[PDB]
Design a binder for this molecule. Structure first.
Ligand code: PD
Ligand code: PD
Ligand code: PD
Ligand code: PD
Ligand code: PD
Ligand code: PD
Ligand code: PD
Ligand code: PD
Ligand code: PD
Ligand code: PD
Ligand code: PD
Ligand code: PD
Ligand code: PD
Ligand code: PD
Ligand code: PD
Ligand code: PD
Ligand code: PD
Ligand code: PD
Ligand code: PD
Ligand code: PD
Ligand code: PD
Ligand code: PD
Ligand code: PD
Ligand code: PD
Ligand code: PD
Ligand code: PD
Ligand code: PD
Ligand code: PD
Ligand code: PD
Ligand code: PD
Ligand code: PD
Ligand code: PD
Lengths: 172, 172, 172, 172
């Protein structure tokens, strides 16, 4: 009331937690991007890749929040923890951290989906599938591809490999 | 036969009942629209809003019927009950009636979805989600927004509020 | 080294703190925007106003971070505190909170400027002036104008006033 | 007289010295560019990079000279010392020399700025900031980025690294 229908308090809470996770991921990507722009790191294509991901994660959080309002739920925001590292190592280190991060979001989506199914909320299930689950699978595949490529490159002409990957994959 | 597959008689019947509900809702909106065009009511933006909804509900019924034929089911039509009122009061009265009506359609969709799930008809589930459930949530949110706005306006310069809402929200 | 010149550790730290403040302000505006989109609040022009400000504050933080890298400093991120409220009251309440927030950013800029001057960092001084100080003054004037208008409107036909301001100022 | 106002003889002299430094830097870049075009060096992208910088430094000197005339001061030219080397080594050697050179110009700008501040010449301060200090910071960041990239590349497939950097960064 006035609009809320078939929308459990459990799903509402889980949506707010998922928003926090997406915003945390956005923040992590922000840090990753600026790290690669340091004068002693200087890989612009890596910066650009992570900046784009920062945007995508913020967009995901905003989509969740709009959905929360559309269903008559109430957005509740919590502190956003700072990212897990201050310095992110080399390109393969960063790509590995990103995959870990996306898999964690993907698992949260799956957990929310199960909740929605358990709550007989078929509409949430359809909202998650068409707007989040498919994007995560595609993203994780791209990241895995990138990691395989960078790993193949840095074994074992590491500096050269890192430069070529940035120039010929990421700057493309 | 020749085409019907995984399509229960229970789902077929429920689809025919849902068509009747959508057509009844279309009829209700038709009445709502013409009521607002009465010379002693005269709120054209309210008429236009309800006319559009009459169209949307008829389109929903037609989509259901096409789906029924696509699955090899058989459309069966019943009497369409006249709308619940002959006169619809003020704008907030009408908006309230519309929300009640849409929530009832939404609940029928959810009930059909449960049936489809219980009948292991995963394709129906996907047809309902992508084409009906999402539209209902969006519509009900817009209606709730409209009701909040009109309520804020008519407490307590009612005539003035009703005119402004029609001019600046509905005629937009 | 390799590039850092005339860039004190004090200024570097103050820049990182200012980034945190800008990102916190962005988060606050995010919350403000979604609050106004609640079905029981429903003022889209107010949502849009705060969404734009969320974007502007994130852009400010990003400009500071790029500057930090350009000077050879190192970005360090901290936890982002959640916004001061979960519910933001009426339009004038929200506008008041926004002015308080911007004045706080403005004062942080002035404090950083003083630091830069004290550190004989004339280039920072010029970066802050041309890219942050002028924007804050303009923004605060717009906010003050909005607050004066909304205050004039809600004394004392509050609901009506709030609607008109959203329609005729914010939706413009 | 007829126009000179708030323009000290100390600032006038310092401006003439800064012109000499900018023109010397232009000359150094001229030499750097032609060195990379030697048939036994043959890195056209490196030549082009330094040619552009030669142009930028001459433009800076000309801007200073126009400013000197605008303020009613008198341009005085001195001998331009030849560049510090006749042969410039490899790409990282040259990039290092360029950074040393730009940092020296940057420090001269900062020294002139301090003078201007000490002379209560707020207009000079604004001329230097908006037209010279910002450009130097941006330039030095680009140079530092280039040096980090080339260093990463030439450790330790030096010839290969030098070619790739010229083709994929400088020729871009
Ligand atoms: Pd509600
Ligand atoms: Pd960057
Ligand atoms: Pd970048
Ligand atoms: Pd970037
Ligand atoms: Pd939804
Ligand atoms: Pd499901
Ligand atoms: Pd699902
Ligand atoms: Pd490119
Ligand atoms: Pd058949
Ligand atoms: Pd009509
Ligand atoms: Pd009409
Ligand atoms: Pd009409
Ligand atoms: Pd179908
Ligand atoms: Pd299903
Ligand atoms: Pd379904
Ligand atoms: Pd009109
Ligand atoms: Pd450095
Ligand atoms: Pd919104
Ligand atoms: Pd909105
Ligand atoms: Pd909005
Ligand atoms: Pd700067
Ligand atoms: Pd200053
Ligand atoms: Pd300043
Ligand atoms: Pd408009
Ligand atoms: Pd003169
Ligand atoms: Pd050349
Ligand atoms: Pd050349
Ligand atoms: Pd050239
Ligand atoms: Pd001047
Ligand atoms: Pd000054
Ligand atoms: Pd200055
Ligand atoms: Pd080319």
């Amino acid at each position: 009331s006035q609009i809320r229908q078939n929308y459990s308090t459990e799903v509402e809470a889980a949506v707010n937690r998922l928003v926090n996770l997406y915003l945390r991921a956005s923040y992590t990507y922000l840090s990753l991007g600026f790290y690669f722009d340091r004068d002693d790191v200087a890989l612009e294509g890596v910066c650009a890749f992570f900046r784009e991901l920062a945007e995508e994660k913020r967009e995901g959080a905003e989509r969740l929040l709009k959905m929360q309002n559309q269903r008559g739920g109430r957005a509740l925001f919590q502190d956003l923890q700072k990212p897990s590292q201050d310095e992110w190592g080399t390109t393969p280190d960063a790509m590995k951290a990103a995959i870990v991060l996306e898999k964690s979001l993907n698992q949260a989506l799956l957990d929310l989906h199960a909740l929605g199914s358990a709550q007989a909320d078929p509409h949430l299930c359809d909202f998650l599938e068409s707007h989040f689950l498919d994007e995560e699978v595609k993203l994780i595949k791209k990241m895995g591809d990138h990691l395989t490529n960078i790993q193949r490159l840095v074994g074992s002409q590491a500096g050269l490999g890192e430069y070529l990957f940035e120039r010929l994959t990421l700057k493309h």
